[PDB]
Structures are given as structure tokens and as C-alpha cells.
């Protein structure tokens with residue numbers, strides 16, 4: 120009925136009545152799909168996969184064996200509310216990845232964008248927000264309410280503490296504990312993680328203009344290397360966004376203005 | 388015969404003859420339950436769960452997908468003896484948790500008390516002892532013969548080496564390696580882990596009176612921050628428990644006396 | 656039919672036409688075995704195991720539940736070529752281990768020898784080579800193209816960066832990140848991992864004579880404890896193996912010469 124006739128579902132799998140399976144979807148054996156799951160066109164699901172909850176999965180995703188998507192979260196305040204997982208298009212979700220449903224107190228939604236790679240045993244906790252083209256290496260873990268920007272790389276066996284915000288194009292080294300906000304374009308390394316410079320080797324593969332590197336490093340220099348306080352290093356970078364009007368300096372500025380709304384602070 | 392009438396087992400799951408299944412038990416699809424397994428009343432077991440060995444599971448437990456309970460341990464000295472896993476009541480056992488059976492050389496039993504939370508990918512090795520109301524965050528690992536007191540918190544991606552004793556109300560930070568014994572009420576962080584004062588945030592969360600806090604803190608000053616040796620600190624703390632009859636100073640000295648029977652020592 | 660008649664396969668498992676299964680093989684329920692898999696005599700495969708790709712498994716292996724062997728690797732330059740996994744005899748492959756197929760760019764093969772122990776959640780990436788009698792503790796991770804000699808120990812929650820070479824009889828401590836090559840017989844620990852003398856307990860457990868220990872201790876001092884550059888020590892170490900003809904100094908020397916053909920260097 121609600122299963123598209125072009126979908127290929129292995130007979131051994133259990134598809135709960137009410138699940139929406141799009142065109143050209145493939146589902147392997149020994150899967151369990153909940154009655155509120157929606158799976159977009161072209162998505163490929165291997166064997167031994169569990170998908171439940173109010174979960175929306177987009178187009179052309181690949182979900183490998185022993186993955187768990189949309190499951191009850193690990194927050195002790197969750198009370199069975201119809202919270203959601205929302206996954207975009209063309210994501211790679213490897214073996215034993217866990218993506219838990221959100222909480223009402225945290226915004227109701229755990230959200231993942233497009234073109235992401237979640238390696239083996241990646242955990243995405245309740246109410247996380249992952250942008251586009253991110254990579255979380257093996258055993259990576261995001262705490263509750265964690266926000267990732269675009270083109271973020273989380274190294275292997277690294278954890279981001281709850282509520283922390285990771286700016287776009289950040290690289291977190293392997294075996295690193297992130298306990299504060301990480302401004303965009305910077306390398307985070309250590310336990311707890313500290314700024315290790317800019318992600319220059321990564322920004323160059325993205326195709327950044329040479330004099331856009333200098334504008335970004337100026338904001339990094341003002342924030343970390345000029346010996347100024349948070350508010351004073353924030354006034355200067357915000358002034359550069361209006362005088363020189365560099366799109367990356369404004370992004371680097373927008374992050375610090377949003378991090379000022381909370382008592383987390385930034386890594387230093 | 389041994390399966391209660393009110394239990395609901397999914398027809399795809401495999402239950403060997405001899406498995407004792409209590410009332411109001413729910414077993415999801417694609418499970419394997421061994422012939423020497425006992426499931427207490429009200430326990431909920433999701434899909435894709437493996438439970439074998441001589442395993443006793445109490446009441447109102449929740450065991451999520453891809454968990455393994457009672458399986459052959461990773462000790463090379465084990466030779467197939469009918470050793471046991473014992474799990475208490477109201478435990479939350481999340482995805483991909485492994486709980487292995489004991490060894491005859493270690494005491495024959497891997498034991499877990501009540502009201503514990505074992506997060507995703509938690510490992511409990513052979514002959515471990517876990518008390519009540521403990522929390523092991525994602526990827527936490529207990530080596531063989533490890534003992535956890537009550538209300539212990541092990542941070543994410545942390546490891547307790549074999550035979551080590553973790554006192555009650557201890558908080559182990561994330562990505563920390565515990566190599567020696569941790570006295571009760573203490574925060575331990577690092578690899579190898581070192582003490583960082585009292586777990587004041589946990590104690591005030593559990594309704595500790597202000598007099599009990601200053602009593603425990605004084606016992607901490609005697610142990611670490613007074614220059615007195617381990618033998619001298621044990622003498623004074625034992626004299627405090629006998630004179631003042633404080634229930635938590637007693638727990639503090641008792642741990643030190645039991646740790647004195649071994650050569651590991653305490654963290655410092 | 657290439658399934659041997661003495662093999663015992665649970666009817667719920669999916670054995671695709673083309674899989675070759677030797678005599679006395681046992682396969683538990685809910686397994687998926689691909690059409691290009693070969694399984695050798697006496698090998699025990701528990702439940703919920705996925706084995707696919709062009710994968711040859713030797714004799715008397717023990718593969719536990721939720722393991723994945725031969726799956727598409729995480730290298731984003733891979734393009735579905737028929738690459739291989741080769742696993743030797745008498746290996747212990749614990750729960751949720753992942754072993755990925757090779758890449759055409761890196762030698763086409765992921766290879767594992769005999770008598771190895773891969774503990775829970777071990778990851779063996781594409782094109783890795785593991786020798787004999789190695790132990791990888793819980794949550795250990797080998798990046799792409801990593802080589803392990805014989806009798807190697809990787810501590811729990813430790814990661815070996817891609818292309819790095821680990822010499823024989825090395826013990827990598829728990830929660831360590833190996834970013835360069837590790838000469839044989841060396842204890843490596845830290846993040847990044849640095850050398851801390853010889854694996855004396857490992858060598859003595861394997862019956863190393865004291866004359867062998869003194870020669871290895873002597874080769875260690877030349878490389879690390881005499882201020883000699885890499886070119887100097889490598890030439891002097893190669894002179895010791897030619898003169899004294901100590902079989903372990905030669906292994907020590909051969910590793911340094913093979914590592915010199917690359918630019919990763921050695922830990923220090």
C-alpha cells in the first residue's frame with residue numbers, strides 16, 4: 120500500500136504497517152522498520168538494521184548493518200514523546216551507527232543534512248544538528264544538543280560534550296574531548312581540546328582564495344593571539360565584517376555572537 | 388512449560404528449551420536466548436539480542452538491540468566452565484553492550500545490581516561486580532575483576548584496568564584510564580587518572596547534608612592533602628569512623644582497608 | 656553445491672549460491688554469507704554475522720555475533736572493485752568486529768594471519784596486514800594500509816594512523832594514538848604515542864633469553880638514547896646485525912630499513 124512497488128524488501132525483514140518506503144529503495148534481511156518511518160527514494164539499507172520512531176530519511180542514503188536510527192534516546196528526561204529524527208540526502212551511515220530521537224525540551228528534532236559520512240560506531244545523541252558534508256570518524260560521539268556546521272571533521276574516538284557548537288570547516292583531532300564551542304576554520308586537539316591553529320590543509324582542498332585565508336587568520340589572530348578578552352576580540356572581528364565585508368570573517372563573526380548567548384565560552 | 392503464559396515472544400526469535408522466561412516479558416524479533424537463561428518479570432528485550440550462558444536477569448530490565456549478555460569471556464584461561472552472569476532489577480542496557488560470564492579463577496560470577504545505566508557499547512568483562520545506580524557512558528570499558536561501588540559514574544570512552552576498585556559516588560571523567568584504586572566520593576580524570584577533589588556536584592544532587600560534605604572533605608584532606616602517608620591516613624580515618632559514627636566516613640575507611648589487602652594502591 | 660554435508664547451518668541463515676563452506680563448519684542463526692565467501696574447516700560462526708565480498712576464511716576460526724567481515728571499505732576512492740579479505744587459521748574474532756576489503760590502489764587485499772585475537776569492536780580498515788598471534792583490545796582501530804608484525808598488542812581504545820608500520824612484539828598502551836612507525840619490541844604509549852623502552856614482560860613471556868634482551872636493549876639505546884640522527888643510528892644498527900648476528904637485532908634493523916623507504920618516520 121504505502122510501499123512503492125519498485126522497492127525491493129527482503130522477505131525476512133519486518134516492515135511495520137504505516138511505514139512509507141519510496142521508489143527504488145532496497146532493504147536487506149533481518150531489518151525492523153517502524154510504523155512512522157519514511158524512507159526516501161533510492162536509499163539502500165543493508166541487513167540487521169533497526170529504524171523506528173518518527174523518522175524521515177531522504178534520498179540515496181546508504182545505511183549499513185547493525186545501525187540503529189530513531190531509537191529512544193539516553194536522556195533520563197525523555198518520557199515517550201513523539202520526537203523525530205530527520206536525515207537528508209546521500210548520507211553514508213556505516214556499521215553500528217546510533218542516531219537517537221530528540222527531546223521536547225531540546226527542540227524535538229535530531230537533524231542531519233546532506234552528503235555526510237558517519238563512520239563505524241558513530242553516535243549522534245538526542246537533539247543534535249549536523250549540517251552538510253561532515254565526517255565523523257570511527258567511534259565518534261556527539262553529546263546531546265550538539266551543533267555541527269558544514270564540512271566538519273570529527274576525528275576517531277573523539278567526543279563533543281553536550282550543547283557545544285562546532286563551527287564550519289573545523290577539524291577535531293583523534294582522541295579529543297571538546298568541552299566548549301569551537302569557532303569556524305580552526306583545528307581542535309587535546310583533552311580538553313585547545314585551538315591548534317587553522318585547518319589550512321582542509322580549507323585549501325575546498326578551494327579557498329589566497330587572500331581569504333589572510334582575512335580569516337586575522338580574525339583568528341585577534342581572537343586568540345592578540346591578548347584581548349572575549350568582548351574586545353569580538354568587537355574587532357565584528358568591525359572587520361562591516362568594513363572589509365569578507366564572507367568568511369562574517370561567518371567567523373556570526374559564530375561568536377551566537378556563542379555569546381550561552382555560558383559555554385570557546386576553547387582556548 | 389518454563390515460559391510464562393503472559394510473556395510475548397516474537398515468533399522469529401530462538402529460545403532454546405530450558406530457558407526460563409518470566410511473566411509480562413517481551414522479546415522482540417531475531418533474538419537468541421540460551422537454554423540456561425532466566426528472565427525476570429517485566430523485562431523488555433528488543434530485537435537482535437543474544438543471551439546465553441548460565442545467566443540470571445532480574446525484573447523490569449530493558450535490553451536494547453545488538454547487546455550480548457552471558458557470552459564467553461575474553462580471558463584465555465577460560466575453558467568452558469558453567470560460569471554465571473547475574474543482573475539485578477530495573478537496569479537500562481543500551482545498544483551493543485557486552486556483559487561476559489565470569490571465570491572459575493575469578494569467583495565464577497559477573498554481577499550487576501539494580502537501577503544501572505550501561506550506555507551504548509559498554510563492556511563489562513568477566514568477574515566484574517557492579518553495585519546500584521551506576522552509569523557507564525558510551526564506550527566505557529571495565530577490565531576483568533573490576534568492582535564498582537554505588538552511584539559510580541564512568542565517563543565516555545574511559546577504561547578501568549583489571550582488578551581495580553572504584554569506590555561509591557566516584558566520577559571518572561571522559562577519556563580517562565584508571566590504573567589504581569579510586570576512593571569513594573572522588574573525581575578521577577586523566578590517563579592514568581589522578582584525583583581532582585570531591586564529586587561535590589554528584590553528592591549535592593543526591594541530597595547530601597551539609598554536615599556529611601564537610602565530614603567527607605576532611606577525610607579527603609587527611610588522605611591526599613596533608614602530607615600523611617597511606618598507613619597514617621588509614622589510622623586517622625579509621626579513628627574518625629569509630630568516634631563520630633558517620634556513615635560515609637565509615638564507607639571511606641572500609642574501602643581503604645579493603646584496598647590495603649592488595650598491592651595496586653590508590654590513585655594520587 | 657559446495658556446502659560440505661558435515662557443516663551445520665541454522666535454517667534461518669542466508670547462504671547465497673556460490674559460497675564455499677568446508678567440513679565441520681557451524682553457522683548460527685540470522686547470518687548472511689555472500690556468494691564469494693570461502694570458509695575453512697572447523698570454523699565456528701555465531702549468530703548475526705555478515706560475511707561478504709571476495710573473502711577467504713581459514714580453519715578453526717571463531718567469529719562472534721554482530722561481526723562484519725569483507726564489507727565495502729570506508730575509503731572514498733573505492734569504486735566497487737572485486738577486492739579481497741584473507742583470514743588465516745585459529746583466529747578469535749569477537750563481537751562487532753569489522754574487517755573491510757582492500758582497495759585496488761593499495762594492494763587489493765586485507766590480510767590477517769593465524770592465532771590472532773580481535774577483541775570487541777576492533778576495526779581493521781582496508782589493505783591492513785596483520786601477522787600472527789596479535790592481540791587488539793576493545794575498541795582498537797587500525798587505519799588504512801597499516802601493517803602489524805607478529806605478537807603485537809594494541810591496547811584498548813587505541814588507534815594506529817594510516818600507512819603506519821608496527822614492529823613485532825610491540826605493545827601499544829591503552830588510549831594511544833600511533834602516528835608514525837613503531838620499531839619492534841618497543842612499548843608505545845601516549846597521544847601521539849612515544850617510546851618507553853622495551854616490552855620486557857612480553858619478551859620474557861615468550862621465552863626471550865637474557866642475551867637476546869641485552870642485544871635488543873643495546874639496539875634501543877643507539878636509536879633513541881645516544882643523540883644519533885636516524886641516518887646515523889640506522890647505519891650503526893645495520894652494522895650490529897651483520898657483526899653479532901643476533902636474530903632480533905636483524906629484525907630490528909630490517910624494520911628501520913623498510914621504514915626508511917617512506918617519509919612517516921618513527922615515534923620518538
Ligand SMILES: O=[P-]([O-])[O-]
Pocket residue numbers: 276277293294295544545561562563812829830831
Ligand atoms: O582517546 P580516548 O583514549 O579517550
